[PDB]
């Protein structure tokens, strides 16, 4: 393999953690126009072994480390300290492009499980827009399935491996922290249409079957672990939100999820703990498109008319893999 560039239509003046870094590490691009398609061509793909994923993982780590400075970091009994000014934080689109001597193949088969032969191949010079969204359980601001929902795993029969779902219909989520009013400045809530959401599962579940015969599926909350993977976590405006999804995973109104702002977090960049400064004042509010989930399946028990699925995640490579699956780098020969 080889190292790639990237691309970002990010402003030079707008001082925001993503933009300022994007301005000093990318290019606007690109050579028009489209993906030159191939016909009657067959090519092998493998989403789970794709060097572009590893390269992306390293870049986003560098961004956060240079952008969101924790005041204190603890790893292996060692303490690191630095300035931790509050910053503005918000996702930016990103494309990855190939250098002189390589090209990026793109699989266009609508129903693709990530492995095997692709019959509608093409060749772009750079990828689609990727939002470097760091989160657990729920994938936000991603790309939608072309037709109906699609699921992918390294081995569905193996319970240790995560199942990646790709929705075909976005579910908008509004999280807000009111100006508090004798109130807890860390108390926030998330609202989503109950009616809208009670139809997305009705389509995922149908496809979760079929693989597991006519077993009945039940969703339960996380079995336990760090608070960060038991709850739906994400970064909003530099602030860290943690949302209880029990009502979301209990098998025609509104779902209201309770939230907490935390200053102490276990790092995704490295095994350890980090502390950020207290939350800013005023309203903190973010609207995002839910486009996917990460699931793990309860094993052990036999076909007791249930397999049971619980929210997972943690390895942010899975977040990157969910978007980068349909690409591969090749050498011209």
């Amino acid at each position, epitope marked *: 393999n080889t190292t790639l560039f990237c*691309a970002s239509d990010a402003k*030079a*003046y707008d001082t925001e953690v993503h933009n300022v870094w994007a*301005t000093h590490a990318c*290019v*606007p*691009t690109d*050579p028009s126009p489209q993906e030159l398609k191939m016909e009657n061509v067959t090519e092998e793909f493998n989403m789970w072994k794709n060097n572009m994923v590893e390269q992306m993982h390293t870049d986003i780590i560098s961004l956060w480390d240079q952008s969101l400075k924790p005041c204190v970091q603890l790893t292996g009994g060692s303490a690191l300290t630095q300035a931790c000014p509050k910053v503005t934080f918000e996702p930016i689109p990103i494309h990855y492009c190939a250098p002189a001597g390589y090209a990026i193949l793109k699989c266009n088969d609508k129903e693709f499980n990530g492995t095997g032969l692709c019959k509608n191949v093409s060749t772009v010079q750079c990828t689609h827009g990727i939002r470097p969204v760091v989160s657990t359980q729920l994938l936000l601001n991603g790309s939608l399935a072309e037709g109906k929902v699609m699921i992918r795993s390294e081995n569905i029969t193996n319970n240790v491996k995560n199942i990646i779902v790709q929705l075909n219909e976005s579910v908008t989520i509004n999280c807000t922290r009111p100006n508090n009013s004798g109130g807890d400045i860390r108390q926030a809530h998330c609202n989503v249409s109950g009616s809208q959401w009670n139809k997305t599962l009705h389509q995922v579940v149908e496809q979760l079957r079929k693989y597991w015969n006519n077993n009945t599926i039940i969703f339960n909350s996380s079995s336990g672990g760090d608070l960060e993977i038991t709850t739906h976590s994400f970064n909003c405006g530099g602030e860290f939100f943690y949302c209880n999804t029990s009502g979301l995973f209990n098998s025609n109104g509104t779902i209201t999820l309770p939230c907490r702002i935390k200053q102490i977090i276990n790092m995704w960049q490295r095994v350890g703990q980090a502390i950020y400064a207290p939350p800013i004042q005023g309203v903190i509010r973010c609207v995002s498109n839910i486009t996917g989930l990460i699931l793990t399946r309860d094993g052990g028990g036999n076909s007791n008319e249930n397999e049971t699925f619980r929210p997972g995640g943690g390895d942010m490579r899975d977040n990157w893999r969910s978007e980068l699956y349909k690409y591969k780098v090749v050498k011209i020969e």
Partner: antibody, heavy 119, light 107 residues
């Protein structure tokens, strides 16, 4: 071959607006970034901003409180607006093409328009 | 913010001589550097991009090398038309230029 020609009023008084235009002949504006660069007397070149498709220009930090760049696609021309000019904006102003990645260097260049700001 | 520094600031050279001028960036910029030629009263002209690749039409006596923070423009044998002020430019970020290197004729 491709030619960049510039026009616009170059004698201004303080607090007025500088408005220059650059026409492109031999090529369309499509799929190309189009940029402005200025050169104060006896000093180095300074990037003002660039743009390809209407709805996403990119400007210098020190000027974005004052600068507008826009495309006139039907005539294959583009323009630079600069509000609240002072003596410090006295310079030769150039327009220049900026093709798609990785052809990022500015090329070709217009002949430049002399702009003098004084009362 | 990234800063471009050209050296030397001022060169005096005879016709026929070889000359090499350098441009140093305050932080790494890999090969995202270009050189322009500008004569007095005239617009800059593209000479080299991607550190070492000549623009079509540029004479073979020109060449360039470098990557990261140290870059090079070389003329193997000067002709009268080459005497001018040369600017380097960071091709991304703030698109900042060097302060320029003036090449004058010795006599």
């Amino acid at each position: 071959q491709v030619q960049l020609q510039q026009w616009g009023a170059g004698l201004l008084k303080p607090s007025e607006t500088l408005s220059l235009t650059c026409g492109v002949y031999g090529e369309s504006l499509s799929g190309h970034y189009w940029s402005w660069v200025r050169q104060p007397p006896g000093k180095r070149l300074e990037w003002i901003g660039e743009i390809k498709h209407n709805g996403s220009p990119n400007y210098h930090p020190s000027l974005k409180s004052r600068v507008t760049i826009s495309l006139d696609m039907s005539k294959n021309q583009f323009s630079l607006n600069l509000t609240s000019v002072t003596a410090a904006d006295t310079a030769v102003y150039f327009c220049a093409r900026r093709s798609n990645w990785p052809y990022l260097p500015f090329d070709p260049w217009g002949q430049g328009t002399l702009v003098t700001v004084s009362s | 913010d990234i800063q471009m520094t050209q050296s030397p600031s001022f060169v005096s050279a005879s016709v026929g001589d070889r000359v090499t001028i350098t441009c140093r960036a305050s932080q790494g910029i890999s090969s995202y550097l270009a050189w322009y030629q500008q004569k007095p009263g005239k617009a800059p002209k593209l000479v080299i991009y991607a550190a070492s690749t000549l623009q079509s039409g540029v004479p073979s006596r020109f060449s360039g090398s470098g990557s990261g923070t140290e870059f090079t423009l070389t003329i193997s044998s000067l002709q009268p038309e080459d005497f001018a002020t040369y600017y380097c430019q960071h091709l991304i970020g703030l698109r900042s230029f060097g302060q320029g290197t003036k090449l004058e004729i010795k006599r």
